[PDB]
Amino acid sequence: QSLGSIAKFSIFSVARQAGPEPIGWWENIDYDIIFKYSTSSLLLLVNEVRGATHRTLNFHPFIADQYLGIIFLFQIENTFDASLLIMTDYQFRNTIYKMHTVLEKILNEISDELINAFISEFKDDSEAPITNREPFRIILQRMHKKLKTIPLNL
C-alpha cells in the first residue's frame, strides 16, 4: 500500500466572487460529491480573519462519510483563497498523521503547479467559467502517480 492507493480522490478548489468552486478533480467522481467536499474544504475558513494567510495543512475528519480529508489551504495572486484536498478512508487516519511531513512536501509542490496553471488559464478573466478543466486534471493525475510511489509508513 502507498499514499496513492488510499487516495480516493483529490480536488483543486478556488473561492471566487461566488464562493468556493471546484476547478479540477481526479479521477471520475460525481459532481455533487465533488461540490460538497470542495465547499467544506474552503468553509473550514469561515471564521479566519484573513482566510488562509499561512499555507495550512488541515486534517479534517468527515465522521459520517468515514473519510479523512487532507486539506491544503493556500492563496492565488496575479487574492483568491484556494484548497487542494486529498480524501482517504477514515481508518487510515493514524498513518496519515505519522506521514505529515511528506504530505506537506508534495502538497506544496502540487499547489505550486496548480497556482501557475490557474494564473495561466485565467489571464483575461479571473472570474470566467471553467470551460477547460484538463490542465488541472493532468496536474492532479500527476500527483496521484507520485503518491503511488510513497509506501504507507505502517
Place this chain on the structure above:
Amino acid sequence: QSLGSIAKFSIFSVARQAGPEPIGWWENIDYDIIFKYSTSSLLLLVNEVRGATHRTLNFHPFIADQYLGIIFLFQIENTFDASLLIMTDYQFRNTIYKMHTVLEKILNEISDELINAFISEFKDDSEAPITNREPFRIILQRMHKKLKTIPLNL
C-alpha cells in the same frame, strides 16, 4: 518540554439546548476567549449528520491566532454532543501529529472522568446553569499534571 508545557489551556464544553456552552476550563482564561474556542470546537460539527457519533480526535489550526486546537469530540447520555479541547501554539503542530496515539489515549481517559462528573452533577436538571465549575476544573487540572509527564517526541 512536555505536552503539558505547551498546553496553553483546556476546555470541556457541552452543546445543550442553547448550543455550545463551556462547562469548565483550565487554568485562568478570560471567558470571552473560552467561549470563542468552546463554540468553534463544537461547530466543527455543523454539517455532521449525527454530531460526534465516533469519538473523534480533530487537530484544528486556528491560523490567525497562531494556535493549534486538539479537539476530542464525544457524547454524554443518561444525548449531548461534547468536546474536550487542548490548545497549543501553532509552531508545535508537527510534534503534535507525531504524538497522536498518546493524545488519543489521555483524551479518552479524561473524557470518561468529565462524562461521569457531568452526569453526577446534572442529575436533576441536565439544562441547569453551571453554578459549580470546580469538579470540572479539578479533572482538567489533573489532565495537565499528567500531560506534564509526557516529554515532547522531538
